[PDB]
Amino acid sequence: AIPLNRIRRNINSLESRDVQNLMSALKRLKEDESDFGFQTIAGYHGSL
Amino acid sequence: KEDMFSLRAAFKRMTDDGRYEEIAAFHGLPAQCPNADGSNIHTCCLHGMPTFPHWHRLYLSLVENELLARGSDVAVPYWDWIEPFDSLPGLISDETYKHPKTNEDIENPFHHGKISFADAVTVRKPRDQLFNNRYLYEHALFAFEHTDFCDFEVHFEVLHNSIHSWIGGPNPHSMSSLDFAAYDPIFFLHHS
Amino acid sequence: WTMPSDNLPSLLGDADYYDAWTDSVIENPFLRGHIKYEDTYTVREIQPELFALAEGQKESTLFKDVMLMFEQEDYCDFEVQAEVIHNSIHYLIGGHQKYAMSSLMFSSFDPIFYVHHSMVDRLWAIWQELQKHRKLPHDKAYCALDQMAFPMKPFIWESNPNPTTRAVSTPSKLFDYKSLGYDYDHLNFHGMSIGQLEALIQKQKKADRVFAGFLLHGIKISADVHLKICIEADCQEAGVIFVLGGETEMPWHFDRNYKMDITDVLKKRNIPPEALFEHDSKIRLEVEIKSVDGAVLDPNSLPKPSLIYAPAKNSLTPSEIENLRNALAAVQADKTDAGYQKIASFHGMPLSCQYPDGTAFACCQHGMVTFPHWHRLYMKQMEDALKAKGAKIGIPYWDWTTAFHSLPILVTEPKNNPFHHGYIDVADTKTTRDPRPQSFFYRQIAFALEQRDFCDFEIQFEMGHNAIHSWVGGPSPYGMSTLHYTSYDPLFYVHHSNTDRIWAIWQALQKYRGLPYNSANCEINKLKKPMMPFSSEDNPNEVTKAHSTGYKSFDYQQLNYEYDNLNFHGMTIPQLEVHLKKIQEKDRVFAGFLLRAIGQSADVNFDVTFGGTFCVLGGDYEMPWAFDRLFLYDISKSLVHLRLDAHDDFDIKVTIMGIDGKSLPPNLLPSPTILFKPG
Amino acid sequence: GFWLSGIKASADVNIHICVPIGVEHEDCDNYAGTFAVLGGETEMPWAFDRLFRYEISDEMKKLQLTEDSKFRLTTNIIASNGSKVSNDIFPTPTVI
C-alpha cells in the first residue's frame, strides 16, 4: 500500500491530469534558481 | 383435455383460414419495414432494442385476441421451460391427436405451421441441450435481479433467444431462425 | 524502449502545448533543458537505428539484450550488461552532438534522461525480484564491497538540498528501492510474469550459444563500436555496442567483459559452431570503432572481442464429498490389480479358494468369531484401493442405527454418480437393489455393546449387521441380500465402515472397563487360522497379508485409520456405559435361537403379538458354520403387550422367510429357548 | 460480460474457462456455459449499449478458482447452420 504519488508508471499509461501535473511541476523546477533547482541537480552529474 | 381440444380446434379454425400466417408475417421473413430513406427492407420485429418485450407483448396479444374470437375456451397458455422436462408438452409435440368430437385421429394444429408463400412447412430439430436443463432457472433468477429496465431487458432477451435456438436448431424454416420462427405456433406459446 | 515504437512518446516528444487555463501557449518542459554556463539548450539528433532496435516483438535485439541481462545471477554480471544497454539509448536519442544525450557531460540537463533512467532503474528492480524468485541474494551483493560501504560523493556533502538523499547516500542503503519509499507500476517484461520470465530464461540456457566478450574502459570521449564477423575475409554486420564519455570524465575500467550473443548472427551465415573450433575453417571477427565526433574514426584502442562457446547444461463439507466419487470412479476399472472386480470377488460370487480337494469355496469369513477382522480388513483392501487417487479421506460410514426416513445421497443420486451401482463382469449387469420397510437397530446394537465377552458380542454384532444386507437388497440375486454378489455394490463398504465403527466403539468400551479389547480369550482356536484371500500369495497388498491373521487386526490402530469419533449417537463412551448400565436396571426377557448354516439367505419373523425379527446372511458354496452361543432378542415389549409377567407362560411363535419371494420353510432352526434377566 | 450485436444470422455461443498450466504457457477449455443470439438476414441492425452477464461463480468454485486467481475466458461460436466454429465476432468476454 504505497502512496499514490510515489508510483513510477509506464509513460503511455499516464492520464492527461498526470501529464499536466508533471509539466507544470517541471516548468516550475527548471525555473527554480535554488539549490533544489534543476541547474544544480543536473550539475551534480556532468560537472567538474 | 377439454381446454386443450378447445385450443386445438380454435387454432385449427384459425389456420384453415389464412389468418395466423398473416400474423406470422408481422414478425417473419417477408419484410414490410423498409426505409426511412434506405431503401432497404427489413423484417418488422424489433430484437436489438429495449422495446423488444413490448413488441412481442403485442404479438401474443394479437394472436390470443383473434384466437378467443375463434371461440377458444382459454387464453394462450404459457409453457414454462424453466422447469426441466424429458419431453416437449403434449400440446405441440405430437404430430396427431385423437379428436373426441369426430371420433377420428387428426393432425395437431400446434405441431407445425405452414409457410404458404414459400410452399413450405415449419419443422423442429431439437438440440439435446433443450432437455432437463436446470440452467434456465438460475438464469431467470439473474434476470429478476436487475433493477434497471435495460439490463433487465438485455438479459431477458438473451434468455429468450436460448430456446429459439435449442428448439429449432438445424432447419432453415424453423424456430432457430428469426426469419421463419413466427410461422411455428410454438412461437407464441414460448413468448407468452 | 524494448517495445517497438514509431516515435518518442508525446510527453517527451511534443514541442509545445496549449494550456486552456491561461490563454497562454507553453513550451513542453521535457525537451531541450537549458545549460546555464554553456549558454546552450540540449539537443536530440535522433539516429534512426532506435526504430531498428525494436521493430520485431520478442524478436527485437533490445529484447534479447535485456533477457541476457536478466539471465545473470551475479550483480556484476547483471550490472555490466545493464550499463551497456543503458549506453545504447543514451547514444541513440542524442547522437553526434555535443550538448546532447550522447554526450555524458551534458546529458543530465535533458529531462528525458530521468525518464530513461526510470526505465533502467525499473529493469534493475525487475532483476532484483527475479533474484528473490531464484532464491539468490537480492537486497545484498557479493560484488565489490570496497565501494558498497563508502558514501557517494555528490550527495553526502553538507551542501545537499534535501536531508533524505544525504541519509541514503550509501549504496548498501539504496539496494532495496522499497525502503527508499517508491514503487513501479508493474514489474513485468512484455506479456510475461516473473514465473514466465524465469521459465523462458531457463529455456534460453537450454540452447548452445556464442558470445562476444568486450572489455571496455574510459576513452575520455563517447563512442559507438561496431562488431562485424567475416568467414571469407568478407565482412558483414554482426552487432553494435555503445559507450558514454566526455572531456571531463571519471577514468573507468570494467571488471569483466560485456557479452553479446552471435548465435543467430552465426546461424544466418550457416556457420556451424563446432567448426568455430576448427582451424581448417577460418573465421575472423573485426571491429569498426566510431567516435561521437564522427567518424572519427578512432584507432582501435579497445581489447579485441573474444569468442565464447556456451554449451547448454452427514457433516460432510463439499468438496469432501466431491473428491471421492472420482476415486470410486477411478478404481471402477483399474482394472489390473483387481482392479476392483478382484477386490469385489473376495466377498462376492467368483470363487475365492479351495478345499484341499480344491473344490470351490466362497472365501467369506462371516459366521465365525473372526468375523470382524476379515471385513475390517476388507475395508482396508478396499480402502487402500483408493490409494493416492485423492483417497484424501476414509470410506465414510452411515450410522444406520439412527433412524432414517430414506437412504443416503451418495448412493441415491441417479445421474453421474459412482455409488449408484456396480457392474459384474461375471453377470453382465449392474447391481439391483430393492429396499423394504425410537430406532430398531439402536435397540439391537446396544445389546451387543452390553455384552463383555467378545464371542458373546460377535453373535449379536454379526446379526445386527446382516439385518441390513437383508433389507437393502431384498429379492434380487444380484444384490446386497445375497452373499454371491453383495460385495459388488458400493453400498456395502459404506455400511461397513459403520459396522467396523461399531466394533471399534466396543473396544473403547471394553478398554474403559478394563476387559481385554485388543485381545480375546475365546476361542484361542481360530484367530490363529490365517485368512484367505488375505492369506493368498495372490493379493498384491503387503499390509493385509501382514495382518492376515486373526489376532493381529484387533488393534486397528496399525491400519492406520481413525474414526471421527467413536461416540454412539449423543454419548460419551463413558456416557454410553452409564446408558447401558441404566438400561440394565429393568429386568428383561430374551429369546435366543440357535442358528447354523444354510445355503440360502433368509429373514425370520417372531411371534408369541409381533416379537420378530431378525435376518441371516448366506449363499451357495459358502463355508458351513454354526454359532457357539445363542442369539438373543429382547421380547419384553411383547409381554407387556400381552400383559404377561414372565410368569404366566407363553408360546413363542416364529416364521422364517427366504430372501427370494418364498417361502418361510420351517426349522431348520430348532426351538427357541426363552430366558429372563434381572434387574 | 458479453458485448452483443447483430450477426447476419442466429448462432450459439458457448463459454469455456481457460486455466493456464504452470510450466510453461498453456491453455485452455473447461465448459462454463452457453447462451444464444437470435437473428436473420435482412434484420434491423443492432448493438447492445451494455454488457450481458453470465454467472460463472460456481464453475470457478468447482475448479477451485478465484477472482484473483489466474485464468481467462473464451467463447466458441457455433452458427445454427451446424457449421461452423466461427471466429471472433464479439469482443473477448470481460470478467466482472
Residue identified by cell 552529474 is A45
- C111–A46: do the CB atoms touch at under 8 Å? no
Task: Give the nearest chain C residue to A18 (CA atoms).
Answer: C11
Helix axes of B52-68 and B19-27: crossing angle, nearest 10 degrees? 180
Cell, residue C282: 577460418
Residue type, A48: L
- C200–D23: do the CB atoms touch at under 8 Å? no
Q: Which residues of B touch D52 (CB under 8 A)?
A: 154-155, 158
Taking the CB of residue A8, how many other CB atoms lie within 10 A of it? 16
Chains D and C touching, counted as 3 or more CB pairs less than 8 Å apart: yes
Task: Give the nearest chain D residue to C196 (CA atoms).
Answer: D24
Q: Which residues of C touch D25 (CB under 8 A)?
A: 196
Helix (H, G, I), strand (E, B) or coil at B123: coil
The number of C-beta contacts closer than 8 angstroms across A and C is 78
Among C554, C482, C486, residue whose Cα is nearest residue C519: C554
Task: Give the nearest chain A residue to C113 (CA atoms).
Answer: A42
Chains B and A touching, counted as 3 or more CB pairs less than 8 Å apart: no
- B48–D45: do the CB atoms touch at under 8 Å? yes
**Shortest CA gap D68–chain C (Å):** 15
Taking the CB of residue B111, how many other CB atoms lie within 10 A of it? 20
Residues 6+ apart with CB under 8 A from B169: B125, B126, B127, B176, D80, D82
Chain D CB within 8 Å of residue B47 CB: yes
Residues in chain D whose Cβ is within 8 Å of chain B: 4-6, 9-10, 12, 33-50, 52-53, 55, 80-82
- Which stretch of DSSP H or E encloses residue C655? strand C653-658
Residue identified by cell 451446424 is D82
Resolution (A): 5.1
Residue type, C177: Y
Q: Which residues of A touch C178 (CB under 8 A)?
A: 2
Facing residues of C34 across strands?
C41
- B158–D37: do the CB atoms touch at under 8 Å? yes
| Cis previous bond, C560, omega within 30 | yes
CA B22, CA B59: separation in Å to the nearest integer? Answer: 12
CA C583, CA C568: separation in Å to the nearest integer? Answer: 15
Per-residue HEC secondary structure of B100-111 comes to CCCCEEEECCCC
CA C286, CA C225: separation in Å to the nearest integer? Answer: 11
CA B20, CA B183: separation in Å to the nearest integer? Answer: 8
Do the Cβ atoms of B131 and B86 come closer than 8 Å?
A: yes
CA B74, CA B68: separation in Å to the nearest integer? Answer: 7
In whole angstroms, how far apart are CA D48 and each of B48, B165, D7, D39, D63? 7, 19, 12, 14, 31
Task: Give the nearest chain D residue to B46 (CA atoms).
Answer: D44
- A23–C36: do the CB atoms touch at under 8 Å? no
* Kind of pairing between the strands at C284-291 and C223-230: antiparallel
Chains C and A touching, counted as 3 or more CB pairs less than 8 Å apart: yes
Residues C364, C368, C370, C371: is their CA dihedral positive or negative?
Answer: positive
Do the Cβ atoms of C101 and C112 come closer than 8 Å?
A: yes
In whole angstroms, how far apart are CA D64 and each of B4, C318, D19, D67? 49, 12, 11, 11
Residue identified by cell 468447482 is D62
DSSP codes, C447-486: HHHH--SHHHHHHHHHHHHHHHHHHHH-S-SSSTTSHHHH
- Which stretch of DSSP H or E encloses residue D75? strand D72-79
Shortest CB distance from A36 goes to which of C34, C161, C246? Answer: C161
Exposed / middle / buried, residue D2 (Cβ in 10 Å: 0-12, 13-18, 19+):
buried
Chain D CB within 8 Å of residue B169 CB: yes
Cell, residue C642: 400381552
Residues C536, C541, C546, C548: is their CA dihedral positive or negative?
Answer: negative
Residue C103's φ and ψ, nearest 5 degrees, are -85, 125
